[PDB]
Amino acid sequence: NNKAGVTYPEIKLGETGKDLKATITFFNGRTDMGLASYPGKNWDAYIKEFNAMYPNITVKVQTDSNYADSALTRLQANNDSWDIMMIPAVDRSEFSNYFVSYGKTEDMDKEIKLANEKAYDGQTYGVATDGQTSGVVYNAKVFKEAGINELPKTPEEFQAALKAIKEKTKAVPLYTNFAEEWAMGAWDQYIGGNATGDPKFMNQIMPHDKTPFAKDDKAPDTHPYAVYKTLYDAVANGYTEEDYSTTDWESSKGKMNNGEIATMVLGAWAVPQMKQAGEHADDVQYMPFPITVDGKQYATLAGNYSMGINKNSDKDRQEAAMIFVKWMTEKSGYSKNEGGIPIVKNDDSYPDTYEHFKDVELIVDAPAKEGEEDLFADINSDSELGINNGNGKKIQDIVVDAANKTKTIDQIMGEWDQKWGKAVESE
Numbered sequence: 260n261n262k263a264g265v266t267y268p269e270i271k272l273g274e275t276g277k278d279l280k281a282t283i284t285f286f287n288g289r290t291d292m293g294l295a296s297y298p299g300k301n302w303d304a305y306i307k308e309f310n311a312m313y314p315n316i317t318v319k320v321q322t323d324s325n326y327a328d329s330a331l332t333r334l335q336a337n338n339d340s341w342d343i344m345m346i347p348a349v350d351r352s353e354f355s356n357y358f359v360s361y362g363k364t365e366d367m368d369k370e371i372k373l374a375n376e377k378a379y380d381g382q383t384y385g386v387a388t389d390g391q392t393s394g395v396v397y398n399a400k401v402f403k404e405a406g407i408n409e410l411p412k413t414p415e416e417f418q419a420a421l422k423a424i425k426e427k428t429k430a431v432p433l434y435t436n437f438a439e440e441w442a443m444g445a446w447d448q449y450i451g452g453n454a455t456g457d458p459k460f461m462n463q464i465m466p467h468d469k470t471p472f473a474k475d476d477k478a479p480d481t482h483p484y485a486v487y488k489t490l491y492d493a494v495a496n497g498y499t500e501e502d503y504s505t506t507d508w509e510s511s512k513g514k515m516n517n518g519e520i521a522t523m524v525l526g527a528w529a530v531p532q533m534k535q536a537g538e539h540a541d542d543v544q545y546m547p548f549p550i551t552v553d554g555k556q557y558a559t560l561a562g563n564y565s566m567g568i569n570k571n572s573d574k575d576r577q578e579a580a581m582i583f584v585k586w587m588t589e590k591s592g593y594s595k596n597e598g599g600i601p602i603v604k605n606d607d608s609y610p611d612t613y614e615h616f617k618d619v620e621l622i623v624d625a626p627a628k629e630g631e632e633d634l635f636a637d638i639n640s641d642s643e644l645g646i647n648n649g650n651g652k653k654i655q656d657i658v659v660d661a662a663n664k665t666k667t668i669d670q671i672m673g674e675w676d677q678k679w680g681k682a683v684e685s686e
């Protein structure tokens with residue numbers, strides 16, 4: 260939907276669009292970085308640097324809490340109040356209904372990592388702010404006070420860790436952030452590569468499997484089951500916060516930094532935010548999610564939120580926005596301050612955030628089989644599980660079910676399997 264016909268591979272930073280005078284609006288969920296008190300480089304700091312190269316492209320930022328729903332509402336508004344947003348849970352087959360293409364996916368694949376993540380039909384509609392993994396944020400000082408001198412790598416070792424933390428320390432062993440739906444929905448992030456070591460599990464096995472959530476009796480501490488059982492067991496064993504209904508996200512950052520929370524199950528993007536939330540940065544560390552597959556640990560490599568451009572925006576703003584995105588990708592250093600993997604395609608660097616990952620194999624999810632690019636998304640929709648789509652409510656239900664002992668983890672996963680397998684048959 261490119262009005263200026265300028266594509267991302269064609270943009271020569273500091274040359275292209277130097278004649279443009281426009282104001283563009285950047286809508287994202289980093290409310291922290293919209294504040295003057297951000298304990299790092301905030302948005303204005305980046306924009307000031309961008310303006311040294313493009314002084315006549317004014318970039319303004321808007322941010323919203325509960326971004327996952329606000330962005331969806333903003334797309335329904337169908338207006339010009341934004342030029343760049345972080346793409347929300349829009350299906351691939353709908354990208355071209357909202358966003359401007361950055362180019363052919365085969366061209367963008369020479370420029371960025373993950374060019375086919377936010378893509379459809381050979382066109383790329385999203386550029387990730389950085390590369391992400393999911394793991395566990397943990398306070399190493401708390402871990403030392405509890406006698407834990409090596410990181411758990413399996414679910415049983417993880418629960419034993421939580422038992423030691425609760426026994427020997429005052430830290431909340433694992434904080435759920437139940438009250439944040441996105442924080443609960445983030446458990447979906449662990450069920451593919453992390454849990455199976457198989458890049459083909461998410462997009463090629465799950466849409467052809469009626470029971471992806473059942474326990475794997477050949478390796479019962481692997482596969483999606485083991486992921487969600489970890490959460491179930493943390494709550495049921497009494498290793499989480501006393502009141503799940505009153506969790507608070509912003510204050511949990513400080514509590515992790517000061518050793519009042521021992522672990523939180525979050526992506527790498529969360530580590531600098533909590534390192535910075537207090538004076539004890541060096542106690543806040545990042546570990547692989549504790550699953551091991553045949554002696555090895557794996558982490559899915561997938562994008563953070565991707566930057567998408569409004570097809571409503573006029574010709575000048577579309578191009579200015581593409582120039583800003585390219586500047587964020589190639590120049591800003593944002594990935595390096597926000598716990599990110601750089602998105603420039605053949606940048607092999609990585610922040611110190613991954614210093615416990617030296618033995619971990621990062622694997623990008625395989626795409627769908629040729630011809631089934633929509634099969635997973637359709638199954639997900641029919642089943643209403645919303646896997647990796649923001650449905651945190653299904654995760655909240657586990658916390659409630661575990662805390663109240665109304666259902667076993669197996670009953671819950673069987674219920675998911677019924678809904679998923681019915682959807683699989685429908686499509």
Ligand SMILES: OC[C@H]1O[C@@H](O[C@H]2[C@H](O)[C@H](O)[C@H](O[C@H]3[C@H](O)[C@H](O)[C@H](O)O[C@@H]3CO)O[C@@H]2CO)[C@@H](O)[C@@H](O)[C@@H]1O
Pocket residue numbers: 288289290291323324325326391441442445508509526528532561562563564649
């Ligand atoms: O699931 C989509 C996407 O989620 C990414 O993680 C997001 C969170 O979903 C959430 O939006 C979080 O918002 C925070 C923000 O980082 C900061 O802490 C601010 O103060 O508070 C808000 C919550 O109100 O931001 C992270 C990072 O964008 C990430 O897990 C992706 O891999 C994933 O696809």
